[PDB]
């Protein structure tokens, strides 16, 4: 009965997603609708800026990509994936794409502004999270991956830098640059070094089990204060990941260690999330026995903390970044490549 309710939820959510996936929105705002305020954060492919919508006064977070740089870095298809997927999804813990558009030089994705900062900042400052607090965050990711995987979506960039804390203390996942809709296996070498599954490093084909491996890394880092595989250079990280060895802090509970060894299985055919019972092996594990999954989904569980808020447009929960102009050429660049954006 409870299980049937979940099946029905996912079936309807797939119907809703597929309508938008097959007929994406396009060209829903323009640049002069907004004033640009300051940079909130950066990634390998661009920057995200705080902007203010002139007519409404609402603040938003605008991701800006330079088309020529996307082409040079061979990220065309990945960027088309990001926008097509984001405009089609709807889940409590996924950031909302409000508008998208392009001009002669750049591509723009305007999201809801999530003011509480990256989980990363809070985690580094406090050192580590208690197990109850790590569990609160982890449950949101479990539900998010159940949703995404049911739509044939792999996420491929889980890390604290991409988990934003909202004004109710809940997570919003950002940056779908590596997200992809795939049935069966794929091969791209992508992600962040500390979070790569062995099968990615070893140039094997891989599937949604890489997201469950990354969940193991995330839970370990939240509860320990440091990742399970760390070094000064990526190559030394990769050697540790593939080794099959992992060491746990002495303070980790018995149930936490058991869950983490099941998520950090080097053989994907033995990894939790990828066995016959799928996500239910995780949701039914002893470490999650106190979790009320529907209450998490509905945002009714008390949060570990509420971020400080000093008014609309405040960015105190984010680092400062060097600012750079947004140039728009008089000539259209890369039109054919980005036709569908």
């Amino acid at each position: 009965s409870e299980q049937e309710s979940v099946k029905e939820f996912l079936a309807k959510a797939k119907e809703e997603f597929l309508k938008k996936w097959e007929s994406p929105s396009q060209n829903t705002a323009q640049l002069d609708h907004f004033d640009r305020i300051k940079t909130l954060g950066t990634g390998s492919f661009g920057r995200v800026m705080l902007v203010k919508h002139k007519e409404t006064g609402n603040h938003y977070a605008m991701k800006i990509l330079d088309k020529q740089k996307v082409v040079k870095l061979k990220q065309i298809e990945h960027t088309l994936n990001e926008k097509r997927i984001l405009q089609a999804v709807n889940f409590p813990f996924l950031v909302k794409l409000e508008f998208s558009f392009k001009d002669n030089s750049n591509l723009y994705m305007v999201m809801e502004y999530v003011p509480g900062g990256e989980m990363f900042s809070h985690l580094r400052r406090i050192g580590r999270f208690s197990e109850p607090h790590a569990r609160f965050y982890a449950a949101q990711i479990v539900l998010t991956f159940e949703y995404l995987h049911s739509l044939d979506l792999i996420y491929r960039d889980l890390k604290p830098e991409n988990l934003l804390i909202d004004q109710q203390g809940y997570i919003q996942v950002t940056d779908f640059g590596f997200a992809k809709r795939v049935k069966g296996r794929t091969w791209t070498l992508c992600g962040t070094p500390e979070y790569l599954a062995p099968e990615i490093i070893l140039s094997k084909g891989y599937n949604k089990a890489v997201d469950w491996w990354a969940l193991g890394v995330l839970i370990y880092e939240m509860a320990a204060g440091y990742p399970p595989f760390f070094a000064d250079q990526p190559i030394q990280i990769y050697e540790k990941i593939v080794s099959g060895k992992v060491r746990f802090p002495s303070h980790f509970s018995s149930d936490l260690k058991d869950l983490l060894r099941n998520l950090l299985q080097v053989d994907l055919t033995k990894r939790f999330g990828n066995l016959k019972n799928g996500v239910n092996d995780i949701k039914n594990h002893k470490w999650f026995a106190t979790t009320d999954w529907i209450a998490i989904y509905q945002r009714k569980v008390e949060a570990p903390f509420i971020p400080k808020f000093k008014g609309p447009g405040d960015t105190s929960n984010f680092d400062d970044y060097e600012e750079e102009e947004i140039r728009v050429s008089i000539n259209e660049k890369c039109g054919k490549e980005f036709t569908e954006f």
Partner: peptide, 18 residues
């Protein structure tokens, strides 16, 4: 300690995708 070794390492700031 493992914590001290992490904090003295070069990868304690924001990490970029490969």
């Amino acid at each position: 300690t493992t914590y001290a070794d992490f904090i003295a390492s070069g990868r304690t700031g924001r990490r970029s995708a490969i």
